[PDB]
Ligand binder design. Structure first.
Ligand SMILES: *[C@@H]1O[C@H](CO)[C@@H](O)[C@H](O)[C@H]1NC(C)=O
Lengths: 43, 45
């Protein structure tokens, strides 16, 4: 809810899914997106 | 000739993947859910 433009407040989160896989992960990146309001279509 | 399936299986090197009665209300009964056991009086809250 817009008060002044910034994320702050009392938040609560819940579980969604679990995968009992059993391996380790030590790195990550994130698949980003590009769109203009990235050599030809900027971000 | 016979269908003879060599039945190997992975055992406890990973979290397991290969693994009911009627509801009775208002009686001092034993119970057991999917994970949890117990003995009480089953009601409706
Ligand atoms: C656990 O994490 C380490 C660190 O990346 C990794 O090298 C290893 O393969 C993982 N799995 C086991 C079973 O140790």
């Amino acid at each position: 809810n817009l008060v002044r433009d910034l994320p702050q407040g009392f938040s609560a989160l819940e579980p969604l899914v679990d995968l009992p896989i059993g391996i380790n992960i030590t790195r990550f990146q994130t698949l980003l997106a590009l769109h203009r309001s990235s050599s030809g279509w900027t971000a | 000739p016979y269908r003879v399936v060599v039945l190997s299986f992975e055992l406890l090197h990973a979290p397991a993947t290969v693994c009911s009665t009627n509801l009775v209300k208002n009686k001092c009964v034993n119970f057991n859910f999917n994970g949890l056991t117990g003995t009480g009086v089953l009601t409706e809250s």
